[PDB]
Design an enzyme around this catalytic site. Structure first.
Site, mmCIF file in Angstrom:
data_model
loop_
_atom_site.group_PDB
_atom_site.id
_atom_site.type_symbol
_atom_site.label_atom_id
_atom_site.label_comp_id
_atom_site.label_asym_id
_atom_site.label_seq_id
_atom_site.Cartn_x
_atom_site.Cartn_y
_atom_site.Cartn_z
ATOM 1 N N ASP A 159 0.846 -1.196 0.000
ATOM 2 C CA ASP A 159 0.000 0.000 0.000
ATOM 3 C C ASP A 159 0.891 1.259 0.000
ATOM 4 O OD1 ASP A 159 -2.226 1.722 0.502
ATOM 5 O OD2 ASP A 159 -2.151 1.256 2.670
ATOM 6 N N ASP A 193 -0.528 4.970 0.803
ATOM 7 C CA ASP A 193 -0.900 5.830 1.936
ATOM 8 C C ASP A 193 -0.899 5.003 3.220
ATOM 9 O OD1 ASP A 193 -1.568 8.370 0.562
ATOM 10 O OD2 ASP A 193 -2.979 6.984 -0.495
ATOM 11 N N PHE A 217 0.462 9.811 5.209
ATOM 12 C CA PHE A 217 -0.825 10.500 5.071
ATOM 13 C C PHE A 217 -1.245 11.159 6.377
ATOM 14 C CE2 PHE A 217 -4.916 10.768 2.773
ATOM 15 C CZ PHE A 217 -5.767 11.083 3.791
ATOM 16 N N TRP A 243 -10.980 6.479 9.129
ATOM 17 C CA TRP A 243 -11.455 7.678 8.431
ATOM 18 C C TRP A 243 -11.168 8.924 9.248
ATOM 19 C CZ3 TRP A 243 -11.741 6.061 3.829
ATOM 20 C CH2 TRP A 243 -12.268 4.806 3.546
ATOM 21 N N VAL A 244 -10.150 9.673 8.831
ATOM 22 C CA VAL A 244 -9.773 10.929 9.518
ATOM 23 C C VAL A 244 -10.997 11.847 9.661
ATOM 24 C CG1 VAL A 244 -8.444 13.086 9.260
ATOM 25 C CG2 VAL A 244 -7.381 10.885 8.804
ATOM 26 N N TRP A 279 -6.930 17.096 1.940
ATOM 27 C CA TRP A 279 -6.495 16.105 0.939
ATOM 28 C C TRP A 279 -6.938 16.379 -0.452
ATOM 29 C CZ3 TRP A 279 -8.648 13.809 5.490
ATOM 30 C CH2 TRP A 279 -9.994 13.524 5.435
ATOM 31 N N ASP A 333 -2.395 -0.701 5.835
ATOM 32 C CA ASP A 333 -2.852 -0.271 7.158
ATOM 33 C C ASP A 333 -4.359 -0.248 7.374
ATOM 34 O OD1 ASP A 333 -2.607 1.964 5.295
ATOM 35 O OD2 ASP A 333 -3.366 3.228 6.995
HETATM 36 O O1 O84 Z 1 -5.817 6.392 4.751
HETATM 37 C C1 O84 Z 1 -6.771 7.099 4.369
HETATM 38 N N1 O84 Z 1 -7.301 7.873 5.384
HETATM 39 C C2 O84 Z 1 -8.282 8.797 5.157
HETATM 40 O O2 O84 Z 1 -8.729 9.484 6.135
HETATM 41 N N2 O84 Z 1 -8.759 8.943 3.892
HETATM 42 C C3 O84 Z 1 -9.689 10.035 3.595
HETATM 43 C C4 O84 Z 1 -9.430 10.637 2.175
HETATM 44 C C5 O84 Z 1 -10.749 10.358 1.470
HETATM 45 O O3 O84 Z 1 -10.587 9.104 0.788
HETATM 46 C C6 O84 Z 1 -11.795 8.400 0.435
HETATM 47 C C7 O84 Z 1 -11.300 7.064 -0.062
HETATM 48 C C8 O84 Z 1 -12.122 5.967 0.091
HETATM 49 C C9 O84 Z 1 -11.698 4.713 -0.392
HETATM 50 C C10 O84 Z 1 -10.475 4.595 -1.043
HETATM 51 C C11 O84 Z 1 -9.628 5.682 -1.151
HETATM 52 C C12 O84 Z 1 -10.060 6.924 -0.673
HETATM 53 P P1 O84 Z 1 -12.753 9.202 -0.885
HETATM 54 O O4 O84 Z 1 -14.005 8.300 -0.997
HETATM 55 O O5 O84 Z 1 -13.134 10.585 -0.547
HETATM 56 O O6 O84 Z 1 -11.978 9.116 -2.148
HETATM 57 O O7 O84 Z 1 -12.533 8.218 1.592
HETATM 58 C C13 O84 Z 1 -12.937 9.299 2.407
HETATM 59 C C14 O84 Z 1 -11.755 10.239 2.605
HETATM 60 O O8 O84 Z 1 -11.007 9.639 3.675
HETATM 61 C C15 O84 Z 1 -8.336 8.057 2.898
HETATM 62 C C16 O84 Z 1 -7.383 7.133 3.087
HETATM 63 C C17 O84 Z 1 -7.032 6.312 1.907
HETATM 64 C C18 O84 Z 1 -6.033 5.580 1.675
HETATM 65 C C19 O84 Z 1 -5.839 4.862 0.394
HETATM 66 P P2 O84 Z 1 -5.209 3.256 0.692
HETATM 67 O O9 O84 Z 1 -6.254 2.397 1.360
HETATM 68 O O10 O84 Z 1 -4.790 2.702 -0.660
HETATM 69 O O11 O84 Z 1 -3.928 3.359 1.568
HETATM 70 MG MG MG Z 2 -3.267 2.815 3.520
#
Ligand code: O84
Ligand code: MG
Ligand code: O84
Ligand code: K
Ligand code: K
Ligand code: MG
EC number: 3.1.3.-
Lengths: 197, 197
Positions: free
Chosen positions: A11, A13, A19, A46-47, A66, A146
């Site tokens: 992975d 992020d 991140f 989810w931050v 982001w 993660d």
């Molecule tokens: O680690 C994270 N933590 C986090 O808080 N977020 C945030 C950014 C934005 O990302 C999303 C998201 C969902 C699924 C896959 C990738 C991204 P988005 O739906 O807004 O794009 O989800 C809600 C929001 O949450 C994403 C990630 C994504 C990581 C990608 P990974 O799983 O490949 O490492």
């Molecule tokens: Mg990740």
């Protein structure tokens, strides 16, 4: 290095790119009068959900971090991540892919992820990038990631998911025989070797 | 629509998006005094190789077309492609992914591919995009793709490769039992159905 070789999905992020630390730094800089969540206090993937509970409107402010230009490109590597993955990719009979899910807002994120890989791993490593919102459809022996819950269209993925520790997941009890990689200083070679013939 | 569902990987360039026609149009416009290759005369997957044999320096000129901003975004859909894939994705027990290999020059191509999918298929279809230079590591029942040789790290991919006809491949004899999808007007449902339980 190519052979079937052991295949490892890594992975981006939260595993290669910081991140959580990048988010917090930029959030505090842009929104200095708002409350925030120290890293040690992060809970759940989810931050924005945790920020939303903290104060009304804070989820939208978190999102804006982001979605901003240079958020992904300026993420710092986690300690040891670049050295570990370069070594891993050089091992005999070992194919490494960076398997990363981009955010839905596509203006900057995909581009910046390619640019980040070129910066830290070099041009030739761009061949190893897989962008997908569904990691279950990517076949491999291992997925180092993660996120606790990795789901999608394939109900029985071929990989073993090794949970990479992050503040948000560090307290989670996993169902045996699920296991973790604590950090890149932890013994990732032993985990790879456990999957070899 | 999700279920395990039949899983179909659909290539983008040469299947959904008209790379060959877009290339030729832009090439003739930018380089009006150079010779060119009419579509019916295209042979072999690599446009620049055929252009290079035609006149010295023409490979570099060809390259400059796909490296240009808006090349990918402005590609036209192939006839029937948008309607077919929308119908396919709506079928019961059928999961469709767009499985596309971006060019090495990453400044515009990944971004523009997401933007193109949003334009023709809508926001919700962005979840179905898989960018990879190795399609063999993506598991599925079918891969519909105009490239004759689809290779990578997995020596025994799970999908059956159905060759989508293009001018560059139309004369190729395939090894039984390999088969083709001639165009989106051809009977793609019958091919999907042949893979169902
Ligand atoms: O680690 C994270 N933590 C986090 O808080 N977020 C945030 C950014 C934005 O990302 C999303 C998201 C969902 C699924 C896959 C990738 C991204 P988005 O739906 O807004 O794009 O989800 C809600 C929001 O949450 C994403 C990630 C994504 C990581 C990608 P990974 O799983 O490949 O490492
Ligand atoms: Mg990740
Ligand atoms: O159909 C094509 N025809 C074609 O002439 N080219 C050009 C663009 C540029 O693409 C490459 C290429 C190689 C492999 C995968 C994707 C792209 P590049 O190595 O420059 O990025 O190869 C040499 C160049 O050839 C690519 C393609 C790529 C299609 C991607 P797809 O297989 O997913 O449909
Ligand atoms: K899991
Ligand atoms: K093939
Ligand atoms: Mg193609």
């Amino acid at each position: 290095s190519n052979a079937r070789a052991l295949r490892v999905l890594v992975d981006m992020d939260g595993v290669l790119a910081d991140f959580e630390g990048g988010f917090l730094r930029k959030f505090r800089a842009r929104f200095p009068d708002q409350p925030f969540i120290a890293l040690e206090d992060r809970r759940g993937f989810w931050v924005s959900e945790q920020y939303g509970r903290l104060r009304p409107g804070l989820s939208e402010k978190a999102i804006s971090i982001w979605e901003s230009k240079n958020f992904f490109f300026e993420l710092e590597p986690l300690p040891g991540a670049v050295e570990a993955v370069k070594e891993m990719a050089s091992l005999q009979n070992t194919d490494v892919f960076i398997c990363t899910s981009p955010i839905k807002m596509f203006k900057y994120c995909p581009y910046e992820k390619y640019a980040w890989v070129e910066k830290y791993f070099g041009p030739d490593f761009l061949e190893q990038i897989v962008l997908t919102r569904d990691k279950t459809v990517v076949s491999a022996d291992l997925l180092i990631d993660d996120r606790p819950d990795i789901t999608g269209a394939e109900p029985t993925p071929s990989w073993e998911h090794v949970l990479f520790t992050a503040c948000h997941n560090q307290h989670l009890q996993l169902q045996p025989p699920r296991r973790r990689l604590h950090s890149w200083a932890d013994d990732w070679k032993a985990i790879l070797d456990s999957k070899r013939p």
